[PDB]
Every structure is written in C-alpha cells, then in structure tokens.
Amino acid sequence: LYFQGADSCIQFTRHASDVLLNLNRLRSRDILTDVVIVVSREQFRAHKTVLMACSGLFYSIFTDQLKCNLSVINLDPEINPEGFCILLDFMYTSRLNLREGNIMAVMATAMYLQMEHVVDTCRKFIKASE
Amino acid sequence: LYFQGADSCIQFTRHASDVLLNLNRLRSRDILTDVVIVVSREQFRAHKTVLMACSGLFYSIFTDQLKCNLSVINLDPEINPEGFCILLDFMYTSRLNLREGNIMAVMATAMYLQMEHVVDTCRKFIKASE
Ligand SMILES: Cn1c(=O)c2c(c3cc(Nc4ccnc(Cl)c4C#N)ccc31)N[C@@H](C1CC1)C(F)(F)CO2
Ligand SMILES: Cn1c(=O)c2c(c3cc(Nc4ccnc(Cl)c4C#N)ccc31)N[C@@H](C1CC1)C(F)(F)CO2
Ligand SMILES: [Cl-]
Ligand SMILES: [Cl-]
C-alpha cells in the first residue's frame, strides 16, 4: 500500500497507475475530454493534459498560445489511424500492443508524435526479426 | 524500461509515474489548469481530471451536469488550507507529507474529499502514537 520514500516521506505504490486507470475510465465515458484528434477518416476524443504528458508533438501544440485553445487537431494525413489508436491506448494504460502487422505504423506514428522510448523499443523489436 | 505483462502485452514500468510527473509540471507552470479550489483565504489551481481521478468528492462534483462547468469550487470553510495543500500535492506526486502537526487536518480533509486509503493510513499512524 505505502512505503518510506528516499526523501523520508510516505509514498503510495499504486497511486500513479490508479490515477492513470481513472483517466482512461474518464476517456472511455467521454468525461471532461476537451479535444478530438482527427487521423484521416477517424476521430479520437482525449484529454489535452494526458496527450501533452505523453508526446513531444502534443506538448508543443498545446503550449502554443494560439493552438492551446483548438478543440480539433488534425494530424498529418499520412498517419495510420490504427497506429495512432495503439499509441493513444498506450498513453492511457502503459501497455503497448505491438504486433508484426502494426509495428512499422506504430513506429512511424511514435516518431511523428515524439515518443522516443516507444520508437527505440520498436527499433529493437524490428532488429530482432531481421 | 518494459516487460511482458500478464496479458502477453508490452508494459512500460515507469509510464504512469512519468505521466503524473508531467501533470505536476503542468500544474507548477499553470498550464491547462481549468479550476481554482478555494479553501478559506487560499486558492489552489488544478486540473479537474486529476482531482476527479483522486477524490470521490471531486468525482461527484465534476460529473454533475451543472457543476462540471464551474471554474471556481469553494470548499467547506472548516477545511484547513494546509491539509488541502498536502493532499493536492499527494494527488499529483503519490507522496503524502504526514507530520504530527498536520495529521488531524490531513485526515479530516481526506474524509471530506473521500480519499479512503489516505484516511485509513492516517488512522493507523494515529493509533501507533496512542
Ligand atoms: C519527447 N517525449 C517523449 O519521448 C515522451 C514523452 C514526452 C512528454 C513530453 N511532455 C512534457 C515534457 C516536459 N515537461 C512537461 Cl510539463 C511535459 C508535459 N506535459 C514532452 C516530450 C516527450 N512522454 C512519455 C510519458 C511520460 C511518460 C511517453 F512515454 F508517453 C512518450 O515519451
Ligand atoms: C473513494 N475514492 C478514494 O478513496 C480515492 C480515489 C477516488 C477516485 C474516484 N474517481 C473515480 C472512480 C471511479 N471511476 C472514475 Cl472514472 C473515477 C474518476 N475520475 C472516486 C472515488 C475515490 N482516488 C485515489 C486515486 C486513484 C488512486 C486516491 F488515492 F487519490 C484517493 O482515493
Ligand atoms: Cl511504512
Ligand atoms: Cl521483454
């Protein structure tokens, strides 16, 4: 449940994961979602704070004085919707559903979105299959 | 960095804590904060999604069709501002700064805010000092 942290302060082991679980439940129920990400013919509702916390691209967009107030964000039409969906799920769950059939699209999408450790992980899995 | 989850899916160990760290950085810079919590003469800016994810009281308030749109929320004037501050910091960090001089106020505030495991932890620490 809790432990003594290195800073001599009480820390709750599952707190961060339980907060993320609740943020994903709010997303699933469309509660307090404040942006729709458009990827070709597909739309994905989300919370800007979670997107900024998980992506260098979204962090840049939503800290821009003009774009921070947009309710619709259109991604590059070359982005694969399934690749984006897999990464949005990862943002809200810490689970990345990589498969042989989606890894190239997930990697290209993570490069565009500036999610470096995901890109590095994709490169390592690709290197193992060559 | 990552591991094979029980659901045979790749999971990133530090993802949830790193997201929470970024949400606290946005709070510290007042980025995308969408509510001010008023506690007697003190004001605390925050993100409604994080408050709802961490409190039964805030979850009820921000799911109410009328209150979900309020930009200012006034707490009961009997709530101690320091106790609220300690709990808001806990929400964004997983670290609870309990001390002999603040534990009663933190416990009463956590009861009001419906943060059960925090209340239980406070009760256990109080029981040890009697
Ligand atoms: C480059 N980059 C990544 O490669 C990356 C990111 C990531 C996040 C920001 N956002 C921030 C940076 C710094 N400060 C502030 Cl307030 C914010 C905010 N808000 C920026 C660049 C990023 N986030 C992680 C999650 C934390 C775990 C991710 F795994 F989802 C993908 O990897
Ligand atoms: C009663 N109660 C607590 O006692 C409690 C809570 C807590 C949260 C909600 N919020 C939700 C519930 C269910 N579903 C959805 Cl979408 C939401 C949302 N959003 C409700 C009741 C709660 N949150 C945890 C953090 C998760 C770790 C806390 F540690 F900060 C304090 O303990
Ligand atoms: Cl302990
Ligand atoms: Cl592994």
Curated annotation (Swiss-Prot), chains A, B:
Induction: Down-regulated during maturation of dendritic cells by selective stimuli such as bacterial lipopolysaccharides (LPS), CD40LG and zymosan. Protein levels decreases upon genotoxic stress in a dose- and time-dependent way. It comes from the Eukaryota. Residues 33-100 form the BTB domain. Disulfide bonds: none annotated. Expressed in germinal center T- and B-cells and in primary immature dendritic cells. It is found in: Nucleus. Phosphorylated by ATM in response to genotoxic stress. Phosphorylation induces its degradation by ubiquitin/proteasome pathway. Transcriptional repressor mainly required for germinal center (GC) formation and antibody affinity maturation which has different mechanisms of action specific to the lineage and biological functions. Forms complexes with different corepressors and histone deacetylases to repress the transcriptional expression of different subsets of target genes. Represses its target genes by binding directly to the DNA sequence 5'-TTCCTAGAA-3' (BCL6-binding site) or indirectly by repressing the transcriptional activity of transcription factors. Homodimer. Interacts (via BTB domain) with the corepressors BCOR, NCOR1 and SMRT/NCOR2; the interactions are direct. Forms preferably ternary complexes with BCOR and SMRT/NCOR2 on target gene promoters but, on enhancer elements, interacts with SMRT/NCOR2 and HDAC3 to repress proximal gene expression. Interacts with histone deacetylases HDAC2, HDAC5 and HDAC9 (via the catalytic domain). Interacts with ZBTB7 and BCL6B. Interacts with SCF(FBXO11) complex; the interaction is independent of phosphorylation and promotes ubiquitination. The BTB domain mediates homodimerization. Its dimer interface mediates peptide binding such as to corepressors BCOR and NCOR2. Interaction with corepressors through the BTB domain is needed to facilitate the rapid proliferation and survival of GC B-cells but is not involved in the T(FH) formation and BCL6-mediated suppression of T(H)2 and T(H)17 differentiationrequired for GC formation. It is linked to Chromosomal aberrations involving BCL6 are a cause of B-cell non-Hodgkin lymphomas (B-cell NHL), including diffuse large B-cell lymphoma and follicular lymphoma. Approximately 40% of diffuse large B-cell lymphomas and 5 to 10% of follicular lymphomas are associated with chromosomal translocations that deregulate expression of BCL6 by juxtaposing heterologous promoters to the BCL6 coding domain. Translocation t(3;14)(q27;q32). Translocation t(3;22)(q27;q11) with immunoglobulin gene regions. Translocation t(3;7)(q27;p12) with IKZF1 gene 5'non-coding region. This is B-cell lymphoma 6 protein. The lineage of its organism: Eukaryota, Metazoa, Chordata, Craniata, Vertebrata. The chain holds residues 5 to 129 of 706 of the full protein.
